[PDB]
């Protein structure tokens, strides 16, 4: 595999080049909003983002080395986590607001459903990234870690697992390398590494609660969930 042969800077360059674009929503300020229609906006946005995420994952070093079944599994497990960390990343420069799209800025007020608790958790995570001064190089490393780690726990296949483990170690070294170049001391490096990885626990949480919320509305017969989005959601049941 070429993923294990990459240097830290090459790993960063690869991840930066693999970055998906920022998509627009069909939001219209002149158009009346509703509880269902707002979810429709986010649904339609996430659905289009998924296609770009799938192609993004293929450019993540070490991912295509895996079997198709393992690739499907990891994406099924992490798709909402990856969407959310992207959302949280885009919302850094906007305190108290979530930038779903360049034409779609929502605050805690402009709400629903139960979603308002999830909104607050996303806002708090964004506030966290902001105060940590999260860098783009760190962000792409974190997002790649989420992809490979979120799904990972005969005969073998075990072989697939420790390959992911080695790539995860590589991204770990990459993170440390980035912080070292930033001029951080060894103590500050370990602390920041810890701070960054603990956020992944929160992203997992928001994903799980979000998945419950998405499954909740799917039974309410409210919003056109796309064919792919129905697949990704159904994989987490239950």
């Amino acid at each position: 595999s070429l993923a294990l042969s990459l240097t830290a800077d090459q790993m960063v360059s690869a991840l930066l080049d693999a970055e998906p674009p920022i998509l627009y929503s069909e939001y219209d300020p002149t158009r009346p909003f509703s509880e269902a229609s707002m979810m429709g906006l986010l649904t339609n946005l996430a659905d289009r983002e998924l296609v770009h995420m799938i192609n993004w994952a293929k450019r993540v070093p070490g991912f295509v080395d895996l079997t198709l079944h393992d690739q499907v599994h990891l994406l099924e497990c992490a798709w909402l986590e990856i969407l959310m960390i992207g959302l949280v990343w885009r919302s850094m420069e906007h305190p108290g607001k979530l930038l779903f799209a360049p034409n779609l800025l929502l605050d805690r007020n402009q709400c629903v459903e139960g979603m308002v608790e999830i909104f607050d958790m996303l806002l708090a995570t964004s506030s966290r990234f902001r105060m940590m001064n999260l860098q783009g190089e760190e962000f792409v490393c974190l997002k790649s870690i989420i992809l490979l780690n979120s799904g990972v726990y005969t005969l073998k296949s075990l072989e697939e697992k420790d390959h992911i483990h080695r790539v995860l170690d590589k991204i770990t070294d990459t993170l440390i390398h980035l912080m070292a170049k930033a001029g951080l001391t060894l103590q500050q490096q370990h602390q920041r590494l810890a701070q960054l990885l603990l956020i992944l626990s929160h992203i997992r949480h928001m994903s799980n609660k979000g998945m419950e919320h998405l499954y909740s509305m799917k039974c309410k017969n409210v919003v056109p969930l796309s064919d792919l989005l129905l697949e990704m959601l159904d994989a987490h049941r239950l």
């Binding site: 799938i54 293929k58 198709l68 499907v72 994406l75 099924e76 064919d227 792919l228 697949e231 990704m232």
Partner: peptide
Amino acid sequence: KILHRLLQD
């Protein structure tokens, strides 16, 4: 499965 197909193409 759609995800399985998109990963191939």
